[PDB]
Write a protein that holds these residues in place. Structure first.
Motif, PDB file in Angstrom:
ATOM      1  N   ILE E  64       9.632  41.706 -23.386  1.00 59.25           N
ATOM      2  CA  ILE E  64       9.110  41.395 -24.711  1.00 59.25           C
ATOM      3  C   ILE E  64       9.408  39.934 -25.016  1.00 59.25           C
ATOM      4  CG2 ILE E  64       9.146  41.929 -27.142  1.00 59.25           C
ATOM      5  CD1 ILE E  64       9.646  44.760 -26.589  1.00 59.25           C
ATOM      6  N   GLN E  65       8.357  39.143 -25.139  1.00 60.29           N
ATOM      7  CA  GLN E  65       8.382  37.709 -25.363  1.00 60.29           C
ATOM      8  C   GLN E  65       8.552  37.396 -26.841  1.00 60.29           C
ATOM      9  OE1 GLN E  65       8.502  35.810 -22.667  1.00 60.29           O
ATOM     10  NE2 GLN E  65       8.303  37.719 -21.508  1.00 60.29           N
ATOM     11  N   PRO E  66       9.044  36.199 -27.174  1.00 60.50           N
ATOM     12  CA  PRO E  66       9.143  35.820 -28.593  1.00 60.50           C
ATOM     13  C   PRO E  66       7.814  35.771 -29.333  1.00 60.50           C
ATOM     14  CG  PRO E  66      10.616  34.488 -27.303  1.00 60.50           C
ATOM     15  CD  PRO E  66       9.803  35.268 -26.319  1.00 60.50           C
ATOM     16  N   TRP E  67       6.705  35.431 -28.665  1.00 62.68           N
ATOM     17  CA  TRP E  67       5.420  35.419 -29.360  1.00 62.68           C
ATOM     18  C   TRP E  67       4.990  36.824 -29.755  1.00 62.68           C
ATOM     19  CZ3 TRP E  67       0.913  37.857 -27.895  1.00 62.68           C
ATOM     20  CH2 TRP E  67       0.817  38.300 -26.573  1.00 62.68           C
ATOM     21  N   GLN E  68       5.351  37.829 -28.956  1.00 64.31           N
ATOM     22  CA  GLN E  68       5.045  39.207 -29.317  1.00 64.31           C
ATOM     23  C   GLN E  68       5.871  39.667 -30.511  1.00 64.31           C
ATOM     24  OE1 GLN E  68       5.571  40.762 -25.256  1.00 64.31           O
ATOM     25  NE2 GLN E  68       3.507  41.609 -25.451  1.00 64.31           N
ATOM     26  N   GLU E  69       7.145  39.269 -30.570  1.00 59.33           N
ATOM     27  CA  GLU E  69       7.972  39.599 -31.726  1.00 59.33           C
ATOM     28  C   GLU E  69       7.455  38.917 -32.988  1.00 59.33           C
ATOM     29  OE1 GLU E  69      12.172  39.084 -31.145  1.00 59.33           O
ATOM     30  OE2 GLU E  69      12.558  39.023 -33.304  1.00 59.33           O
TER      31      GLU E  69
ATOM     32  N   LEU F  72      21.305  26.122 -47.168  1.00 64.38           N
ATOM     33  CA  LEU F  72      19.975  26.722 -47.120  1.00 64.38           C
ATOM     34  C   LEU F  72      18.943  25.765 -46.534  1.00 64.38           C
ATOM     35  CD1 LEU F  72      19.697  28.780 -50.421  1.00 64.38           C
ATOM     36  CD2 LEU F  72      19.853  29.588 -48.077  1.00 64.38           C
ATOM     37  N   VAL F  73      19.046  24.473 -46.854  1.00 61.25           N
ATOM     38  CA  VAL F  73      18.151  23.485 -46.258  1.00 61.25           C
ATOM     39  C   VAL F  73      18.392  23.387 -44.755  1.00 61.25           C
ATOM     40  CG1 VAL F  73      17.625  21.017 -46.197  1.00 61.25           C
ATOM     41  CG2 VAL F  73      17.750  22.202 -48.373  1.00 61.25           C
ATOM     42  N   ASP F  74      19.661  23.431 -44.339  1.00 61.74           N
ATOM     43  CA  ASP F  74      19.983  23.430 -42.917  1.00 61.74           C
ATOM     44  C   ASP F  74      19.457  24.681 -42.222  1.00 61.74           C
ATOM     45  OD1 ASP F  74      21.715  22.724 -40.441  1.00 61.74           O
ATOM     46  OD2 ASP F  74      22.457  24.690 -41.066  1.00 61.74           O
ATOM     47  N   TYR F  75      19.510  25.831 -42.898  1.00 56.22           N
ATOM     48  CA  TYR F  75      18.915  27.041 -42.337  1.00 56.22           C
ATOM     49  C   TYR F  75      17.409  26.893 -42.187  1.00 56.22           C
ATOM     50  CZ  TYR F  75      18.191  31.943 -41.290  1.00 56.22           C
ATOM     51  OH  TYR F  75      17.862  33.122 -40.670  1.00 56.22           O
ATOM     52  N   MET F  76      16.747  26.306 -43.188  1.00 55.23           N
ATOM     53  CA  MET F  76      15.314  26.051 -43.091  1.00 55.23           C
ATOM     54  C   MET F  76      14.977  25.050 -42.002  1.00 55.23           C
ATOM     55  SD  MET F  76      14.264  26.042 -47.105  1.00 55.23           S
ATOM     56  CE  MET F  76      15.580  26.833 -48.016  1.00 55.23           C
ATOM     57  N   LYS F  77      15.931  24.224 -41.589  1.00 57.43           N
ATOM     58  CA  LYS F  77      15.684  23.313 -40.483  1.00 57.43           C
ATOM     59  C   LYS F  77      16.100  23.886 -39.134  1.00 57.43           C
ATOM     60  CE  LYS F  77      15.993  19.108 -43.219  1.00 57.43           C
ATOM     61  NZ  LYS F  77      16.894  18.015 -43.669  1.00 57.43           N
ATOM     62  N   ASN F  78      17.074  24.791 -39.112  1.00 59.67           N
ATOM     63  CA  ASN F  78      17.631  25.310 -37.862  1.00 59.67           C
ATOM     64  C   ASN F  78      18.250  26.672 -38.131  1.00 59.67           C
ATOM     65  OD1 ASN F  78      18.533  25.419 -35.148  1.00 59.67           O
ATOM     66  ND2 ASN F  78      20.494  24.503 -35.720  1.00 59.67           N
ATOM     67  N   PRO F  79      17.432  27.722 -38.191  1.00 56.34           N
ATOM     68  CA  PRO F  79      17.962  29.047 -38.522  1.00 56.34           C
ATOM     69  C   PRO F  79      18.742  29.644 -37.362  1.00 56.34           C
ATOM     70  CG  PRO F  79      15.648  29.228 -38.024  1.00 56.34           C
ATOM     71  CD  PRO F  79      15.987  27.763 -37.929  1.00 56.34           C
ATOM     72  N   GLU F  90      12.708  30.471 -32.746  1.00 56.04           N
ATOM     73  CA  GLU F  90      11.512  31.021 -32.123  1.00 56.04           C
ATOM     74  C   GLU F  90      10.955  32.238 -32.849  1.00 56.04           C
ATOM     75  OE1 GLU F  90      12.831  31.227 -27.948  1.00 56.04           O
ATOM     76  OE2 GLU F  90      10.809  30.553 -27.416  1.00 56.04           O
ATOM     77  N   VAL F  91      11.711  32.865 -33.749  1.00 49.79           N
ATOM     78  CA  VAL F  91      11.220  34.049 -34.447  1.00 49.79           C
ATOM     79  C   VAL F  91      11.366  33.894 -35.955  1.00 49.79           C
ATOM     80  CG1 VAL F  91      11.481  35.688 -32.564  1.00 49.79           C
ATOM     81  CG2 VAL F  91      13.439  35.136 -34.012  1.00 49.79           C
ATOM     82  N   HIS F  92      12.032  32.832 -36.392  1.00 51.21           N
ATOM     83  CA  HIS F  92      12.146  32.557 -37.810  1.00 51.21           C
ATOM     84  C   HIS F  92      11.533  31.199 -38.126  1.00 51.21           C
ATOM     85  CE1 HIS F  92      13.823  31.926 -41.838  1.00 51.21           C
ATOM     86  NE2 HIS F  92      14.043  33.227 -41.862  1.00 51.21           N
ATOM     87  N   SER F  97      10.374  24.667 -35.619  1.00 46.53           N
ATOM     88  CA  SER F  97       9.366  25.560 -35.067  1.00 46.53           C
ATOM     89  C   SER F  97       8.125  25.585 -35.947  1.00 46.53           C
ATOM     90  CB  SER F  97       9.919  26.967 -34.881  1.00 46.53           C
ATOM     91  OG  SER F  97      10.253  27.554 -36.124  1.00 46.53           O
ATOM     92  N   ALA F  98       7.764  24.426 -36.499  1.00 44.90           N
ATOM     93  CA  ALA F  98       6.574  24.332 -37.332  1.00 44.90           C
ATOM     94  C   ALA F  98       5.289  24.453 -36.523  1.00 44.90           C
ATOM     95  CB  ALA F  98       6.584  23.018 -38.109  1.00 44.90           C
ATOM     96  N   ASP F  99       5.352  24.220 -35.210  1.00 46.71           N
ATOM     97  CA  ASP F  99       4.175  24.380 -34.366  1.00 46.71           C
ATOM     98  C   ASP F  99       3.795  25.847 -34.193  1.00 46.71           C
ATOM     99  OD1 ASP F  99       6.572  24.708 -32.885  1.00 46.71           O
ATOM    100  OD2 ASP F  99       5.428  24.533 -31.020  1.00 46.71           O
ATOM    101  N   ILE F 100       4.775  26.753 -34.171  1.00 47.39           N
ATOM    102  CA  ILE F 100       4.490  28.184 -34.097  1.00 47.39           C
ATOM    103  C   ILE F 100       4.513  28.855 -35.460  1.00 47.39           C
ATOM    104  CG2 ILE F 100       5.240  28.447 -31.713  1.00 47.39           C
ATOM    105  CD1 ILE F 100       7.935  29.361 -32.710  1.00 47.39           C
TER     106      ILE F 100
END
Ligand SMILES: CCCCCCCCCCCCCCCCCC(=O)OC[C@H](CO[C@@H]1O[C@H](CO[C@H]2O[C@H](CO)[C@H](O)[C@H](O)[C@H]2O)[C@H](O)[C@H](O)[C@H]1O)OC(=O)CCCCCCCCCCCCCCCCC
Ligand code: CLA
Ligand code: CLA
Ligand code: CLA
Ligand code: CLA
Ligand SMILES: CC(C)=CCC/C(C)=C/CC/C(C)=C/CC/C(C)=C\CC/C(C)=C\CC/C(C)=C/CC/C(C)=C/CC/C(C)=C/CC/C(C)=C/CC1=CC(=O)C(C)=C(C)C1=O
Ligand SMILES: CCCCCCCCCCCCCCCCCC(=O)OC[C@H](CO[C@@H]1O[C@H](CO)[C@H](O)[C@H](O)[C@H]1O)OC(=O)CCCCCCCCCCCCCCCCC
Ligand SMILES: CCCCCCCCCCCCCCCC(=O)OC[C@H](CO[C@@H]1O[C@H](CS(=O)(=O)O)[C@@H](O)[C@H](O)[C@H]1O)OC(=O)CCCCCCCCCCCCCCC
Ligand SMILES: CCCCCCCCCCCCCCCC(=O)OC[C@H](COP(=O)(O)OC[C@@H](O)CO)OC(=O)CCCCCCCCCCCCCCC
Ligand SMILES: CCCCCCCCCCCCCCCC(=O)OC[C@H](COP(=O)(O)OC[C@@H](O)CO)OC(=O)CCCCCCCCCCCCCCC
Ligand SMILES: CC1=C(/C=C/C(C)=C/C=C/C(C)=C/C=C/C=C(C)/C=C/C=C(C)/C=C/C2=C(C)CCCC2(C)C)C(C)(C)CCC1
Ligand code: OEX
Ligand SMILES: [Cl-]
Ligand SMILES: [Cl-]
Lengths: 243, 333, 200, 97, 102, 137, 101, 176
Positions: E64-69, F72-79, F90-92, F97-100
């Motif tokens: 399970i990849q991060p893009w899927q999550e 909180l600002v640091d979390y918004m920059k690096n959660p 990568e998930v938050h 991670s503004a590109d994703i």
């Protein structure tokens, strides 16, 4: 190599993989190499329920039943450690997998028997002096049967174990001694025994297949009523990799 | 020719009950649905409606009365899958998973659609104007909404309305929990339709009964003052119009009987069309109005309204409905 | 015991049902004796008061507050994140007066059962075997009388309307006049409605 | 005789502190530095004979051992209740916000 | 829950069915809960985890990849549920999200 | 009750220094919270992980503490996770991670401060409603 | 002919038969009162007026007799807890008998 | 507020189970049915009394003849439904009778609820469900829904009672 679109809707997903008819070899087992069951499948074909005679001493034989929960019965994707003991017996200790299926079978007269067909925490050993897995290898073992409903299950009146009412709220002034069996839910963990009889071996690919017979108890409705003894017969497949 | 004689018999207006070609479809389907409904309502074993191995008993022999009895909808494990008898390995499996519900509702929906067609067909054979079937399309749309469209939108025939009285109440309460149907304008239009239909029914009946022309004496019933097939009107339309125009004002009263009876047809039919469409549009989860935390004071405190009280009741229903079927925080369907 | 028996919700006439037939005893048993007053205390000795059930509620949760109204104990529905359970708070019940006078109970099932009784007010011993009582509240003759006479009063309002209508409209009871003038019910002809002498 | 084992567990130290053998993993949120890594290790390596055996989890670092030592007084050990730990309820007991 | 250390294949729900994974009536390994009704769903973010017998436990555990999550979280929080005045979520939700799915 | 400057006074760092937000800043923070966070953080709860929430006590027990503007600002920059042991960009959503997560692309530092201020002010206004879930609706 | 719901309208212009119908209705009501009192007396348990009073026992017409002064029975008991009370003729049984007659 | 009143009567009184409310529902829905069916029947059995394709102008209020065919309507409903009205006066009295009787029955039920004389429960079903934890009906599910309504609605719907229900006493199902 069948894809998912070749399988969906047909019922083949509930079937264990079969070995070829011309395959009765022997899989050698080094006493130094550790082994794993990479895939253990158990496809039940017959559920027998022990009848309850009125008299204290009778035959008490198993009777056939009708499955009513369709093709939802096979255990699959079971993995475990296959270790070699000092006696030469091979011990399989399962770790994870789809190792339980709720199954309801209907006895004659319309009565339904729910059971948790499981091999949860199965430890199964062979007889000593097994240096090669042949068509005479047998795995006798035991497993845990937890409660059919877990602790968060609510009965139709909202009573349960870890959640819910502790009394019959729709009878606010009834006597609570007669309803103590239904008001107080109990969690049961019983023991089951299973014998896996190897019938076909593939010494090249490490695959074995055969028949199994297991004995366990049925659902007790969180201790409301007594469970029934259930014998499950079927076929099995196991992939043995060298770890 | 045997086919010509059969066609003459099927379309014959001399039969005590008209058959027609729509009736050629309607009679077997409605007979099958009726027979299976009676048998299932009396003697069906419990059905695992939610697919969680928790069978719900709905038949009279398994501990129900008329009020609590139902034909339980098919299993949530089935979903929208077609589940005829021959798809099941045995009749016990078919009964366990709620197959009778699918049989009954499919035969009933087909038979009721053909009932609408049959109404058109007989109106055509009698030289009538054809739009009684259009009026019947409103309850038929309602039946389609609660038995077919709502299961399709929600993805399971388990969410269709149960064929029973208490099952109907369960459907209503869970529907209000999940969709807030009371705050939906289409249901409000439906309530206006049925309340207005009852009002205008009582109104028209009382106004016609009030203006009956004296044809009988005080001992006999006034209904004997009308003879079936008589040419004269049995009541004074002008007197009823004069009464109702003095009751409100002259221009709120119909002096035209045809306009009045069109209004009597149109008001509940359009209202029920809108409430059936409300059920279908909420089947695709376009819910009623959400005014939770709409009124906010100067600081930012939530000032509750009656909508917040409705929300509390809906929350109680939501957290108690299907109490074992949810494993995850959001009830997404 | 009579005064305590009045302070018990099973004698409330607003607690029965339309088809829960028979006497109040058939509801909850024939009352035999007062068990005495139940006093609940937590493990720090503070007195706890059981929130009584209003007549609206067919069922009611068990909640124990102190004298200042702060919730101090309860019987939790969900027990995974329970903080105020009788087991956690060390809730005991003592009885003063009645049969259980001077007796103290510490076993949490016993204390919980007594608290479930205490939501009904005073706690009584009942004979549920004489009448085969079901344990479901029924209303008194006060409630049945009020119900019958309010229903009868409503139906007799309809009767009054019907018979007043038949009295004042006796001449048109079998129907209106066949030769009723269409210029007697139209607007404009008369000045006073239904008065021929005021015709314009 | 017939007793609800969850209420009995609430009567024990399980109802006051975090039981290393029975408590759902989300309770480890209520202390600093336990969730999700140390909590995952603790729940994975249960049962424990005593509380201080949580310091003998394999693969612990010095920082994690210091964090566990600072929360040693918040932990208890009771016998493994079957109803609390079966069905994967230590990871997901069906309670959300 | 798998990141928290759960065994999603052997986890048992309140009724005895699998909390995360169960079997469809024809035997396929499917997601548990009420979404058992939606096991015929096919989507490009879900098909990498599907084997011949349905959802595969090993690819669930390891592939399970991060893009899927990300896709699963985004699609879970933008379910086609909302009010007529465009309040996103179930009917009991409060007024903060302005969303009705097209 | 009014939106006084005492209501809009929130911790700036973990040391104890405080900042006072303007009402325009608070309203812009509420708008940007609804734009970028409310789909999963409506009412202060977390939809995709309900065991964590945006309550001030929960943010205070986070590692590093998130109950101030800078955290909180640091979390918004690096959660990170709750114990600060792994980065979850990568998930938050984040600036890194503004590109994703495209809704984080045009978020300035002032936008992050306003969002953090809204997160810190909302419990002070709503009581137990913030992060309380459906019990407090 | 007359519809069913109008049968009694034959009494409207017949005062003697209207009096007969009123007398029959009065006889039915008085007989109900007597028989209801007899049934209640058959079912009433007067042993414990403290915890089993008449209103716990579904007594409907006994409180009205008690309200206007009839408190004793020919069987020796009273509703107020006394025993061997000598209530004279006007006991509950005497009132019921008077209504039947 | 009226919607709150409806949900209150469901949660506290189980007003849907009340037979008097059931008679009221039958009266209201039957009145709506009779209204629609009588209007459609009259409009579709009209006599042709003009050449206009819109037929509303083909009626004059002072006319003596009936504007629609009662015989044709009777034959239509006799062959479609099995039964049909044959008496216009009885038809219109029935149109009076159905919703009025329904509303009166519902008013009687509301008087009963004024005294909390509810049709809340069936005692046989509750005895069976108390002794048998496998017996479930739609009525028992409705009772659980009523418990949820009462517990979640009462603190804000009845603020004079000062109900403080802690989170752990609120009846909830799994998850959600
Ligand atoms: C039931 C429904 C079934 C589905 C059918 C819907 C399809 C047609 C939609 C209507 C077209 C016009 C919509 C409109 O303009 O909608 C836009 C506006 C709302 O504007 C914006 O609407 C937005 C909502 O939409 C969208 O925008 C959001 C942006 O953040 C989100 O993306 C969200 O998902 C998305 O839904 C937000 O709320 C914004 O803040 C808000 O400003 O709708 C409004 O409020 C409307 C303003 C008043 C309308 C008055 C209508 C009166 C009734 C007419 C019929 C009378 C009866 C007929 C007979 C006649 C005689 C009796
Ligand atoms: C004013 C009238 C009245 C009142 C208030 C009471 C009150 C009481 N009686 Mg009593 N009784 C009465 C008249 C009355 N009685 C009459 C006239 C008789 C002779 C038949 C009796 C015979 C009688 C007996 C034999 C017993 C009682 C008992 C009781 C007690 C229990 C009540 C109970 O179970 O009710 C139950 C009430 C109901 C279930 C309500 C009935 C609802 C009906 C069916 C509704 C009808 C609907 C209708 C069909 C709708 C039509 C629609 C159409 C028009 C379109 C109570 C104190 C019992 C008791 O405890 O005594 C010791 C007992 O055993 N009574
Ligand atoms: C003191 C009370 C009283 C009296 C003397 C009358 C007298 C009369 N009414 Mg009347 N009425 C009353 C109260 C009364 N009503 C009330 C309260 C209502 C509202 C419900 C009505 C509604 C009413 C209507 C709608 C009509 C009459 C009619 C009539 C006349 C013929 C009755 C007949 O033949 O019925 C014969 C009745 C039957 C053969 C069977 C009736 C059985 C009932 C429905 C169920 C069982 C009732 C039960 C035995 C009563 C128990 C006692 C109860 C009072 C507690 C007659 C003059 C009719 C009329 O005016 O004719 C021109 C007429 O159409 N009444
Ligand atoms: C000699 C006559 C006589 C006497 C002494 C009694 C005595 C009694 N009857 Mg009885 N009864 C009688 C005749 C009599 N009855 C007859 C003829 C009938 C048949 C109709 C009945 C039917 C009957 C029933 C059905 C019941 C009794 C009951 C009772 C007992 C309680 C009475 C009560 O509460 O009344 C209450 C009386 C009233 C509240 C009177 C109301 C008067 C109204 C307000 C008058 C309004 C109109 C008026 C003209 C307005 C103008 C007034 C003017 C002064 C301005 C009591 C022992 C009850 C009992 O316990 O049974 C065992 C009971 O349920 N009786
Ligand atoms: C199929 C669905 C259905 C249907 C058809 C009904 C039908 C009915 N319900 Mg009902 N109900 C249902 C489902 C349903 N229910 C469910 C699921 C619940 C939840 C349990 C309820 C809960 C419920 C409650 C709580 C009540 C009803 C009531 C009623 C009755 C209302 C009668 C009426 O018109 O009152 C409308 C009001 C009147 C007719 C009073 C007169 C109003 C005047 C004439 C209006 C004057 C207007 C004036 C010109 C000013 C206008 C100003 C303008 C600006 C507005 C009717 C029998 C009521 C009842 O039983 O009443 C006895 C009632 O109290 N229902
Ligand atoms: C054992 C098993 C299998 C059980 C089955 C399961 C099941 C649940 C069944 C039980 C059902 C049950 C419990 C029902 C309860 C019903 C209920 C609530 C009780 C009734 C309530 C009641 C007594 C009072 C309410 C008020 C009241 C009087 C309502 C009556 C409603 C009613 C009958 C309305 C009429 C409906 C109707 C279809 C009318 C058709 C009329 C018709 C033929 C018009 C045609 C027509 C129109 C014209 O315009 C013209 C011109 C002509 C010529 C003409 O012909
Ligand atoms: C001539 C005969 C006519 C037909 C007779 C049959 C009539 C139909 C039945 C109606 C009553 C049925 C109720 C259930 C049966 C039952 O158990 O009852 C039986 C009950 C008695 O109840 C019994 O009591 C016993 C001890 O005495 C035990 O406790 C039993 O368990 C209990 O059932 O009978 C009554 O209570 C009858 C009196 C009813 C008085 C009601 C007063 C209010 C009425 C208002 C009317 C308004 C309605 C308006 C309508 C429009
Ligand atoms: C559970 C499994 C087993 C189920 C058993 C089912 C078996 C069905 C056997 C049927 C045998 C015949 C009986 C019917 C006779 C009859 O009706 O007489 C009436 C006439 C008789 O035949 C008419 O009358 C004449 C015949 S005669 O001379 O009168 O004999 C003839 O001249 C005329 O042409 C002809 O149309 O029939 C007609 O009017 C035309 C046919 C209409 C019959 C439709 C049936 C009703 C379907 C309703 C569906 C929903 C029902 C739900 C319940 C509310
Ligand atoms: C939508 C259309 C609504 C009208 C038809 C629906 C009722 C049918 C009942 C059963 C048939 C009853 C029946 O037989 O009716 C027949 C009736 C009279 O028939 P005529 O033959 O005289 O006229 C119809 C055609 O032949 C045109 O000449 O038809 C009409 O009056 C049609 C009116 C259309 C007017 C245009 C549409 C207006 C819509 C009004 C609603 C909008 C507001 C709603 C607010 C929420
Ligand atoms: C597709 C095949 C169609 C046939 C299906 C079956 C249709 C059966 C319809 C009902 C027949 C019985 C009517 C008796 C009465 C009868 O024969 O009536 C016949 C009667 C004829 O009226 P007339 O105008 O001739 O009456 C003259 C007057 O002077 C009366 O005195 O019609 C009506 O009154 C219609 C309104 C009654 C409404 C009746 C319909 C009710 C629906 C059924 C309710 C069921 C509830 C419980 C179910 C378990
Ligand atoms: C169903 C019911 C009802 C109704 C009821 C009724 C209406 C009843 C009636 C009842 C009645 C109405 C009763 C009565 C009775 C009576 C009696 C029981 C009497 C007797 C008498 C006698 C016995 C006499 C004798 C004599 C003579 C004749 C002469 C000389 C003297 C002497 C005394 C010897 C109601 C609606 C409420 C409700 C529900 C239920
Ligand atoms: O199934 Mn009948 O109700 Ca439509 O939501 Mn999800 O699923 Mn169940 O929960 Mn809520
Ligand atoms: Cl439900
Ligand atoms: Cl779920």
């Amino acid at each position: 190599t069948l894809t998912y679109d070749d399988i969906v809707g047909t019922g083949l997903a509930n079937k264990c993989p079969t070995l070829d008819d011309t395959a009765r070899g022997a899989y050698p087992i080094d006493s130094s190499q550790t082994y794993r069951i990479a895939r253990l499948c158990l496809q039940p074909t017959t559920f027998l329920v022990k009848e309850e005679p009125k008299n204290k001493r009778q035959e008490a034989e198993f009777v056939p039943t009708k499955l009513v929960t369709r093709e939802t019965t096979s255990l699959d994707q079971i993995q475990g450690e296959l270790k070699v003991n000092s006696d030469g017996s091979l011990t399989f200790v399962e770790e994870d997998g789809i190792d339980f299926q709720p199954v309801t079978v209907q006895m004659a007269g319309g009565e339904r028997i729910p059971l948790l067909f499981t091999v949860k925490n199965l430890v199964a050993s062979t007889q000593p002096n097994v240096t090669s897995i042949t068509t005479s290898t047998d795995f006798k073992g035991e497993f845990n049967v937890p409660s059919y409903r877990t602790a968060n299950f609510l009965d139709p009146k909202g009573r349960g174990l870890a959640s819910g009412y502790d009394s019959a709220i729709a009878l606010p002034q009834a006597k609570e001694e007669e309803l103590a069996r239904a008001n107080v839910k109990r969690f049961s963990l019983t023991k089951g025994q299973i014998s896996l009889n190897v019938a076909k071996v593939d010494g090249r690919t490490g695959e074995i297949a055969g028949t199994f017979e297991s004995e366990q108890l049925s659902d007790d409705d969180m201790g409301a009523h007594e469970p029934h003894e259930v014998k499950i017969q079927g076929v099995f497949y196991a992939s043995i990799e060298p770890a | 020719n045997l086919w010509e004689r059969f066609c003459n018999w099927v379309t014959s207006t001399d039969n005590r009950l008209y058959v027609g070609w729509f009736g050629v479809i309607m009679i077997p389907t409605l007979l099958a649905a009726t027979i299976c409904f009676v048998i299932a309502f009396i003697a069906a074993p419990p059905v695992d409606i939610d697919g969680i191995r928790e069978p719900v008993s709905g038949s009279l022999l398994y501990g129900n009365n008329i009020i609590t009895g139902a034909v339980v909808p098919s299993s949530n494990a089935i979903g929208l899958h077609f589940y005829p008898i021959w798809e099941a390995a045995s009749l016990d499996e078919w009964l366990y998973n709620g197959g009778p519900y699918q049989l009954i509702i499919f035969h009933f929906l087909l038979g009721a659609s053909c009932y609408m067609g049959r109404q058109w067909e007989l109106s055509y054979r009698l030289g009538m104007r054809p739009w009684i079937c259009v009026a019947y399309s409103a309850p038929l749309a309602s039946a389609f909404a609660v038995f077919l469209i709502y299961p399709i939108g929600q993805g399971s025939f388990s969410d269709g309305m149960p064929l029973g009285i208490s099952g109907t109440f369960n459907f209503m309460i869970v529907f209000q929990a999940e969709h807030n149907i009371l705050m939906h304008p289409f249901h409000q239009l439906g309530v206006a339709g049925v309340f207005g239909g009852a009002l205008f029914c009582a109104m028209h009946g009382s106004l016609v009964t009030s203006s009956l022309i004296r044809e009988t004496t005080e001992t006999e019933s006034a209904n004997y003052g009308y003879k079936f097939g008589q040419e004269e009107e049995t009541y004074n339309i002008v007197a009823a119009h004069g009464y109702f125009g003095r009751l409100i004002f002259q221009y709120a009263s119909f002096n035209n009987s045809r306009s009045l009876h069109f209004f009597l047809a149109a008001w509940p039919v359009v209202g029920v069309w809108f409430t059936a469409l409300g059920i279908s549009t909420m089947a695709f989860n376009l819910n009623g109005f959400n005014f939770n935390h709409s009124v906010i004071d100067a600081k930012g405190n939530v000032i509750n309204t009656w909508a917040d009280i409705i929300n509390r009741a809906n929350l109680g229903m939501e957290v108690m409905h299907e109490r074992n079927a949810h494993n995850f925080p959001l009830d997404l369907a | 015991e009579k005064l305590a028996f009045y302070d018990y919700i099973g004698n409330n006439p607003a607690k029965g049902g339309l088809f829960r037939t028979g006497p109040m005893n058939k509801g909850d048993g024939i009352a035999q004796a007062w068990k005495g007053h139940a006093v609940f205390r937590n493990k720090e000795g503070e007195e706890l008061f059981v929130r009584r059930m209003p007549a609206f509620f067919e069922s009611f949760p068990v909640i124990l507050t102190d004298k200042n109204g702060v919730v101090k104990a309860d019987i939790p529905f969900r027990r995974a994140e329970s903080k105020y359970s009788f087991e956690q708070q060390g809730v005991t019940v003592s009885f003063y007066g009645g049969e259980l006078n001077g007796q103290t109970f510490t076993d949490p099932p016993t204390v919980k059962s007594y608290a479930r009784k205490a939501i009904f007010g005073e706690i009584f011993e009942f004979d549920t075997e004489t009448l085969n009582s079901d344990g479901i509240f029924r209303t008194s003759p006060r409630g049945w009388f009020t119900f019958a006479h309010a229903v009868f009063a409503l139906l007799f309002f309809f009767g009054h309307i019907w018979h007043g209508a038949r009295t004042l409209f006796r001449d048109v009871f079998s129907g209106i006049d066949p030769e009723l003038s269409p210029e007697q019910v139209e607007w404009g002809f008369y000045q006073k409605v239904g008065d021929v002498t005021t015709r314009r | 005789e017939l007793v609800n084992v969850v209420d009995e567990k609430l009567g024990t130290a399980y109802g006051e502190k975090i039981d290393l053998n029975n408590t759902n993993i989300a309770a480890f949120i209520q202390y600093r530095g336990l969730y999700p890594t140390l909590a995952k290790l603790i729940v994975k390596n249960a049962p424990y004979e005593s509380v201080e055996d949580v310091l003998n989890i394999p693969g612990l670092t010095e920082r994690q051992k210091q964090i566990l030592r600072e929360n040693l007084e918040h932990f208890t050990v009771t016998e493994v209740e079957t109803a609390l730990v079966e069905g994967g309820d230590r990871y997901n007991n069906g309670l959300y916000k | 829950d798998q990141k928290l250390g759960a065994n999603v294949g052997s986890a048992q729900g309140p009724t005895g069915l699998g909390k995360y994974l169960m079997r469809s009536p024809t035997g396929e390994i499917i997601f548990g809960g009420e979404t058992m009704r939606f096991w015929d769903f096919r989507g490009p973010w879900l098909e990498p985890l599907r084997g011949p017998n349905g959802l595969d436990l090993n690819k669930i555990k390891n592939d399970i990849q991060p893009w899927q999550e990300r896709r699963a979280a985004e699609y879970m929080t933008h379910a086609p549920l909302g009010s007529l005045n465009s309040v996103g979520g179930v009917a009991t939700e409060i007024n903060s999200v302005n969303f009705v799915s097209p | 009750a009014e939106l006084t400057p005492e209501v809009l006074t929130v911790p700036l760092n973990s040391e104890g220094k405080t900042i006072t937000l303007t009402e325009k800043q608070y309203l812009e923070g509420k708008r940007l919270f609804q734009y970028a966070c409310a789909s999963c953080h409506v009412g202060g709860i977390t939809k995709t992980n309900p065991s964590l929430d945006l309550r001030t006590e929960t943010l205070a027990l986070a590692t590093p503490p998130r109950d101030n503007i800078e955290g909180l600002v640091d979390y918004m920059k690096n959660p990170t996770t709750y114990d600060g042991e792994q980065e979850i960009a990568e998930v938050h959503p984040s600036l890194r991670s503004a590109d994703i997560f495209p809704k984080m692309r045009n978020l300035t530092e002032k936008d992050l401060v306003a969002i953090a201020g809204h997160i810190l002010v909302e419990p002070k206004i709503l009581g137990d409603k913030w992060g309380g879930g459906k019990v407090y609706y | 002919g007359l519809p069913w719901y109008r049968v009694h309208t034959v009494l409207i212009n017949d005062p003697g038969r209207l009096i007969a119908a009123h007398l029959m209705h009065t006889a039915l009501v008085a007989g109900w009162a007597g028989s209801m009192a007899l049934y209640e007396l058959a079912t009433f348990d007067p042993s414990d007026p403290v915890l089993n009073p008449m209103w716990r026992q579904g007594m409907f017409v006994l409180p009205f007799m008690a309200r206007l002064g009839v408190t004793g029975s020919w069987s020796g008991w009273s509703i107020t807890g006394e025993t061997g009370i000598d209530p004279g003729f006007w006991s509950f049984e005497g009132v019921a008998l008077a209504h039947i007659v | 507020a009226i919607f709150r009143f409806l949900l209150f009567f469901q949660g506290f009184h189980n007003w849907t189970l009340n037979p008097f409310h059931m008679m009221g529902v039958a009266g209201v829905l039957g009145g709506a049915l009779l209204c629609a069916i009588h209007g459609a029947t009259v409009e579709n059995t009209l006599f042709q009394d003009g050449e206009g394709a819109s037929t509303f102008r083909a009626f004059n209020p002072t006319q003596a003849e009936e504007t629609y065919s009662m015989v044709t309507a009777n034959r239509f409903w006799s062959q479609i439904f099995g039964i049909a009205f044959s008496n216009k006066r009885w038809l219109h009295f029935f149109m009076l009778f159905v919703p009025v009787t329904g509303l009166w029955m519902s008013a009687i039920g509301v008087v009963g609820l004024a005294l909390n004389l509810r049709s809340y429960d069936f005692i046989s079903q509750e005895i069976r469900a108390a002794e048998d934890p496998e017996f479930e009906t739609f009525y028992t599910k409705n009772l659980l829904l009523n418990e949820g309504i009462r517990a979640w609605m009462a603190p804000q719907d009845q603020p004079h009672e000062n109900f403080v229900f802690p989170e752990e006493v609120l009846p909830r199902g799994n998850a959600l």
